[PDB]
Amino acid sequence: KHEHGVAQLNVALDGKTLELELDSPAMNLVGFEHAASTDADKAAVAKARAQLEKPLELFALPVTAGCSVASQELRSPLFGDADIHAHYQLSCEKPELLKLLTLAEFFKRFPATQKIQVQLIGPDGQKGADLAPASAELKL
Ligand SMILES: [Zn+2]
Ligand SMILES: [Zn+2]
């Protein structure tokens, strides 16, 4: 599932919990897939890393919701000691306030991404949705 500028995002609101799994070809986030030797390359990777380390900002989860990070995983060689995987588990005090999900912010911060294919699974059932910077909201 590897198309440059296209990323998959699986969501799952289960009571308090919210699980976001983002699989993306590395081209969208760092701007290449050759492991980083240069300094321009190493700063582009650390820029991405510290943006992905702040998932309440990227996914623009409302403050009103009481959202805190329980666990976060960035599977890629580029962030150890080519695709990128980014798994967040969140715990929202007031999950009822999570009415809507804005990738608008994600697009601003990784403008290399033109389309995000979204599999949401609520307690309502299962809903697909393609998101572009134009049309980047999803009724949760
Ligand atoms: Zn590629
Ligand atoms: Zn994972």
Numbering used by the authors: 15 to 95, 121 to 179
Copy text from the publication.
The structural and zinc-binding properties of PA4063, one of the periplasmic proteins expressed by Pseudomonas aeruginosa under zinc-deficient conditions, are presented. PA4063 has a noncanonical ferredoxin-like fold. Two zinc-binding sites with micromolar affinity are exposed and are located on the same face of the structure. Two histidine-rich loops, which are disordered in the apoprotein, contribute to zinc coordination in one of the sites. These findings strongly suggest a role for PA4063 in zinc trafficking, possibly acting as a metal chaperone or as a regulator of a transport system.
The structure of PA4063 in complex with zinc was solved by soaking crystals in zinc acetate solution since crystallization did not occur in presence of zinc. Soaking experiments were first performed with hexagonal crystals, despite their lower X-ray diffraction power, due to the poor reproducibility of the tetragonal crystals, leading to data collection to 3.3 Å resolution. Diffraction data were collected close to the absorption edge of zinc (λ = 1.27 Å) in order to unambiguously locate the metal. Two strong anomalous peaks were observed for each monomer (>9σ), revealing two binding sites, according to the ITC experiments, indicated as site a and site b. Site a is located on the flat surface of the β-sheet in correspondence with the histidine residues. The same mode of binding is detected in all three monomers of the hexagonal crystal: besides His124 and His126, the zinc ion binds to Glu87, likely as a monodentate ligand, and a water molecule, adopting a tetrahedral coordination geometry. Site b is about 20 Å from site a, on the edge of the β-sheet where the His-rich sequences are inserted. Notably, a few residues belonging to these sequences, which are disordered in apo PA4063, become structured and take part in zinc coordination, although some variability is present. As for site a, the coordination is tetrahedral and three donor groups are provided by one glutamate, Glu47, and two histidines, His16 and His18. The fourth donor was modelled as a water molecule in monomer A of the hexagonal crystal, while in monomers B and C, as well as in the tetragonal crystal, the electron-density map indicates His120 to be the donor. When evaluating the contribution of the His-rich sequences to the binding and the structural variation thus induced, it must be considered that the zinc-bound structure was obtained by soaking, thus the rearrangement could be influenced and limited by crystal packing.
